[PDB]
Design a binder for these strands. Structure first.
Ligand SMILES: [K+]
Ligand SMILES: [K+]
Ligand SMILES: [K+]
Ligand SMILES: [K+]
Ligand SMILES: [K+]
Ligand SMILES: [K+]
Ligand SMILES: [K+]
Ligand SMILES: [K+]
Ligand SMILES: [K+]
Ligand SMILES: [K+]
Ligand SMILES: [Mg+2]
Ligand SMILES: [Mg+2]
Ligand SMILES: [Mg+2]
Ligand SMILES: [Mg+2]
Ligand SMILES: [Mg+2]
Ligand SMILES: [Mg+2]
Ligand SMILES: [Mg+2]
Ligand SMILES: [Mg+2]
Ligand SMILES: [Mg+2]
Ligand SMILES: [Mg+2]
Ligand SMILES: [Mg+2]
Ligand SMILES: [Mg+2]
Ligand SMILES: [Mg+2]
Ligand SMILES: [Mg+2]
Ligand SMILES: [Mg+2]
Lengths: 230, 145, 186, 259
RNA sequence: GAAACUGCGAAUGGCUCAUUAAAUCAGUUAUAGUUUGUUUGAUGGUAUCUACUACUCGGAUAACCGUAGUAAUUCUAGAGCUAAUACGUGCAACAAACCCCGACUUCUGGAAGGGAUGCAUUUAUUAGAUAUGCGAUGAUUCAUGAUAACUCGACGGAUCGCACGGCCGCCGGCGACGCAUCAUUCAAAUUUCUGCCCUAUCAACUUUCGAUGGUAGGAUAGUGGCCUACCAUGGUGGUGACGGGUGACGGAGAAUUAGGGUUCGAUUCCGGAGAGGGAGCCUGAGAAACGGCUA
């Protein structure tokens, strides 16, 4: 069958195709979460360990973790879970769909593998280069952790380090940097101060109203007692 | 005396095993028997005030309030336990012939143990919340006739 | 599902009613809790009409029980169910329902009695004076004394475990205690 | 229906709005607010049908979204906001102040008021009860809740509310000899002095009112609004002073004006 | 500013009259027998207590990009990032008062210290009078207060836009959105009385397996044989029950008009029901929804 090999360390992916039952025998009878040595899968895959992620069968149906069968079953699935994206469907809407079991079998058309251990020899399509992350941290805490900044270091100047420059199709010079989130500013401090001040004002108003009502009741009671005394 | 059921019958909210005594306490306070006036000019029977029966559906000593329609009728049947059938007799107008025809309505009504009723006496009943499948009225007054 | 409607019922005259509409969500019913006594406490959350919340107790171990005569509320353990007026099989199954008669641990109440009245059923001068003052009106039910002797107290569950998720109640006293003791002595 | 209705048919709209039969298939459904749907006058009706400032629904929305109309000294941007009895509608740009009052025919009228008369209003107390922490409070029939009210104030009384400070400045007890205005029924919009009150246990209370011309009419307690102490209303009444004129004398007056 | 996450709406509207004969429905009642997103008016005081970010906590995921499967679907699996008013946590500005225990003590006392103490839930005790204080109803052990405890509480703001100021970093305005309680509004649910065509070639019907009522429970938002266990034999009927027919949705109304009457009412307004026939259900304040799902 076909295989989709992914190296997260280098952020790379490749497609491979095998037609040899002797090599596929190692993959056969395994499950989604198990690991397999790549020595059987060709001779360039020596010292490599692959971890299965799933796959699709000859009819395109995906494999679902937890279904301990080699065949295809029908399950009522929630939106957002694997095997049921449910785009454009109502909240709380469930759908019954066909999914294949987690056990590898010859019925599979494509498998998914992730490299967990690197072998002696690198592959020309996977491990030579590493596709740089496009977007850097956006949270202030994330930036501080990335740059090992202290509580006094100014994170603001460190965004320009990974801000990216480019040229537009027109030939214009452009640059883009992320908008820092969860960044303490005088506006946030003022908002907190205003919240506390509103709480204080509410408490003071309640106390004043209670005192005024008590004074009115006391005056009325005094007038009533004076009337009663006569 | 009235503990004829599998469970102990008592008035809710009336504490009995109190170290103090209910001498100057109001009804329902200090362990004294609880009773109330239903209003609308109706008088609380002496039997309800000084009785020992437990009836959560009693208008004067229970947890049911009288509101809505107050009707009058004749006791048609008194064979049920704490429930009677009240037959209301009225005339229905036949417009085309400008005459009347006799008609009747059977209204099940709960009767408290404080009332003594018989088949044929006059009864005044007041509306309350649903008490059973068909009972929505409580016997407020009885004229023995 | 379970329905509380009257459509399926017969008329008061005994005649049959013909259906004219389907079941409505606003007249639904739900399955009973069937709460039991077990060390593995389990309470489920139910979303009910209007977004409100209900608590279904599948298993309960402790309950808030009140001694009315002394006006003392303590959290104790529920030992077992002894009497149930509605159904006898509930006593065998140890079902926890409102008004069921249970036995509760007497340790917290014994401790409170010892600390308050200074009696078992260092100290400073003011403390002994307070205890002596309290001793004047110390009157205790002999039946409650015998119950304390065994370490278990008869109580009535006054809450609804299937609705609030708690088996709270009050210790039997006086005529109610005598009635239930008579019914249990068989 | 499976829930709340969001549409109001034009024929089902209340008659006192005076909407055209063929104007359309719908009428502005009043939004939730201080006043009931059947006893309110939407700002859309006020601005378009009555004052004719806006020629269409869109013009009404455009005018309101500029924050130019204030109800009870508060800016309201909701077209279907329910403005009812005794409410004050102020347009500072036009220097215009109106009070919503029932006319002799039982229809809402925008009675022009002075700047000094536009700073307060009158409310009818529903009941007085204790809230949380034992704090006394009362609620009016226009959805207002006031804490720490005067102990003398009780249900069915009237309270003069200063809007700028949002405070009670005076109150009128519901009693015989007070000038009142009918806010419901066929006698809605009539003004007179209470003559007597008939109380029936477990039933509605009846109030008898004598018009300034001696005409007598009876109504329910919930349809009576007290306007002042004695015989002088605390606010200026619309044209006619709540005097209902028979059709015969109305026609006589119309002919006299014609000639 | 596309796209995408988040929030809201899609329970309104429109269509139709199949089912349905005290049933829907009309007038007239009740909720002191309940729920109610939202709008309008008011109300939010104890969390860490010995860890110890509050000058601000943590882990992901979309869009994006790149490896694809299938004949195929807003069918679908891996891999690489990155946000929150998404998710999960967490100091929650600081008090007073009340109650309990309470060393110590010049001891009928007061006293250090400790516990409890926001709002919400649950169960008990207690007050809530009125022929020198104490609210409301025709009517409530009602509103509400106090005490003892209880709950492994989705509560008690880690949010956003404008402006730009006074003291000596501290304070500071106008709003937006969001959580909790009461009241109000928009409503629903159930409910009191009376009222419906032809038919006796329909006279007895209902009650094992709920029929009528009682006791105790379960369920419900709540009352109720709505359901469960026990108990009693009740409940309706020539004043026509029960059964059957309707080419029967009910009403506002339509046709004809001495008067009385006769006939019609599927259809634009009000109320009900249905989405080919049943049944079940998620989401949600609100659906037994069908231009939602499951058999
Ligand atoms: K931000
Ligand atoms: K969306
Ligand atoms: K919605
Ligand atoms: K009706
Ligand atoms: K009082
Ligand atoms: K009818
Ligand atoms: K119920
Ligand atoms: K029963
Ligand atoms: K119908
Ligand atoms: K919603
Ligand atoms: Mg509709
Ligand atoms: Mg037809
Ligand atoms: Mg009826
Ligand atoms: Mg509301
Ligand atoms: Mg109370
Ligand atoms: Mg019950
Ligand atoms: Mg039909
Ligand atoms: Mg019709
Ligand atoms: Mg048609
Ligand atoms: Mg219609
Ligand atoms: Mg439907
Ligand atoms: Mg069809
Ligand atoms: Mg179908
Ligand atoms: Mg359906
Ligand atoms: Mg539809």
């Amino acid at each position: 069958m076909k295989f989709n090999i992914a190296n997260p360390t280098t952020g790379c992916q490749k497609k491979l195709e095998i037609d040899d039952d002797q090599k596929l025998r190692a993959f056969f009878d395994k499950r989604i979460s198990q690991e397999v040595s790549g020595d059987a899968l060709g001779d360039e895959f020596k010292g490599y360990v692959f971890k299965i992620m799933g796959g699709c069968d000859k009819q395109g149906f995906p494999m679902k973790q937890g279904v301990l069968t080699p065949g295809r079953v029908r399950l009522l699935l929630y939106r957002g879970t694997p095997c049921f994206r449910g785009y454009g469907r109502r909240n709380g809407e469930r759908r019954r769909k066909s999914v294949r079991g987690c056990i590898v079998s010859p019925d599979l058309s494509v498998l998914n593998l992730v490299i967990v251990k690197k072998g002696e020899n690198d592959l020309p399509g996977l491990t030579d280069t590493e596709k740089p992350r496009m977007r850097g941290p956006k949270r202030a805490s994330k930036i501080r952790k990335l740059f090992n900044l202290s509580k006094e270091d100014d994170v603001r100047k460190y965004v320009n380090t990974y801000r990216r420059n480019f040229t537009t199709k027109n030939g214009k010079k452009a640059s883009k940097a992320p908008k820092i989130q969860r960044l303490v500013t005088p506006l946030t401090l003022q908002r907190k101060r205003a919240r506390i001040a509103d709480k204080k004002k509410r408490i003071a108003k309640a106390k004043s109203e209670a005192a005024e009502y008590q004074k009115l009741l006391a005056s009325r009671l005094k007038e009533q007692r004076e009337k009663r005394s006569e | 005396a009235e503990q004829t059921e599998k469970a102990f019958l008592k008035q809710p909210g009336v504490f009995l095993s109190s170290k103090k005594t209910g001498k100057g306490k109001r009804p329902g306070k200090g362990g004294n028997r609880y009773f109330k006036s239903i209003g609308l000019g109706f008088k609380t029977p002496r039997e309800a005030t000084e009785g020992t029966y437990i009836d959560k559906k009693c208008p004067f000593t229970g947890n049911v309030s009288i509101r809505g329609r107050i009707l009058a009728g004749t006791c048609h049947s008194a064979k049920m336990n704490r429930t009677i059938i009240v037959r209301r007799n009225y005339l229905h107008y036949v417009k085309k012939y400008q005459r009347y025809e006799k008609r009747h309505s059977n209204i099940p009504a709960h009767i408290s143990p404080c009332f003594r009723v018989k088949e044929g006496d006059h009864v005044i009943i007041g509306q309350c919340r649903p008490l059973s499948k068909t009972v929505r009225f409580n016997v407020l007054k009885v004229i023995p006739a | 599902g379970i329905s509380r409607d009257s459509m399926h019922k017969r008329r008061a005259t005994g005649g049959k009613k013909k259906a004219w509409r389907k079941k409505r969500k606003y007249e639904l019913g739900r399955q009973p809790a069937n709460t039991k006594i077990s060390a593995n406490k389990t309470v489920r959350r139910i979303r009910v009409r209007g977004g409100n919340v209900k608590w279904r107790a599948l298993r309960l171990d402790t309950g808030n029980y009140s001694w009315g005569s002394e006006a003392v509320t303590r959290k104790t353990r529920i030992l077992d169910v002894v009497y149930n007026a509605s159904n006898n099989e509930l006593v065998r199954t140890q079902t926890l329902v409102k008004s069921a008669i249970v036995q509760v641990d007497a340790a917290p109440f014994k401790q409170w009695y010892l600390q308050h009245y200074g009696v078992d059923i260092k100290k400073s001068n003011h403390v002994l004076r307070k205890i002596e003052t309290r001793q004047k009106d110390r009157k205790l039910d002999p039946h409650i004394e015998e119950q304390f002797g065994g370490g278990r107290l008869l109580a009535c569950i006054s809450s609804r475990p299937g609705q609030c998720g708690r088996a709270d109640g009050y210790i039997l006293e006086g005529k109610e205690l005598e009635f239930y003791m008579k019914k249990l002595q068989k | 229906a499976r829930g709340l209705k969001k549409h109001l048919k034009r024929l089902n709209a209340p008659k006192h709005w005076m909407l055209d039969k063929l104007g359309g298939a719908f009428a502005p459904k009043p939004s939730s607010g201080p006043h009931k749907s059947r006893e309110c006058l939407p700002l859309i009706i006020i601005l378009r049908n009555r004052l004719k400032y806006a020629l269409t629904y869109r013009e009404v929305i455009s005018i309101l979204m500029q924050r130019q109309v204030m109800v009870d000294s508060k800016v309201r941007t909701d077209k279907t906001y329910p403005a009812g009895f005794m409410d004050v509608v102020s347009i500072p740009k036009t220097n215009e102040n109106f009070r919503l009052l029932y006319d002799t025919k039982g229809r809402f009228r925008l009675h022009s008021v002075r700047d000094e008369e536009a700073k307060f209003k009158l409310c009818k107390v529903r009941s007085v009860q204790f809230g949380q922490k034992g704090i006394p409070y009362l609620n009016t029939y226009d959805g207002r809740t006031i804490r720490y009210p005067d102990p003398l104030i009780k249900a069915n009384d009237t309270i003069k509310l200063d809007l700028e400070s949002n405070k009670i400045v005076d109150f009128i007890k519901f009693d015989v000899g007070n000038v009142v205005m009918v806010t419901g029924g066929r006698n809605r919009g009539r003004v007179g002095v209470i003559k007597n009150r008939e109380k029936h246990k477990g039933s509605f209370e009846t109030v008898h009112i004598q018009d300034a011309l001696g005409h007598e009419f009876a109504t329910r307690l919930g349809n009576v609004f007290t306007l002042g102490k004695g015989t002088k209303p605390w606010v200026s009444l619309p044209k006619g002073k709540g005097i209902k004129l028979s059709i015969i004398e109305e026609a006589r007056k119309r002919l006299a004006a014609q000639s």
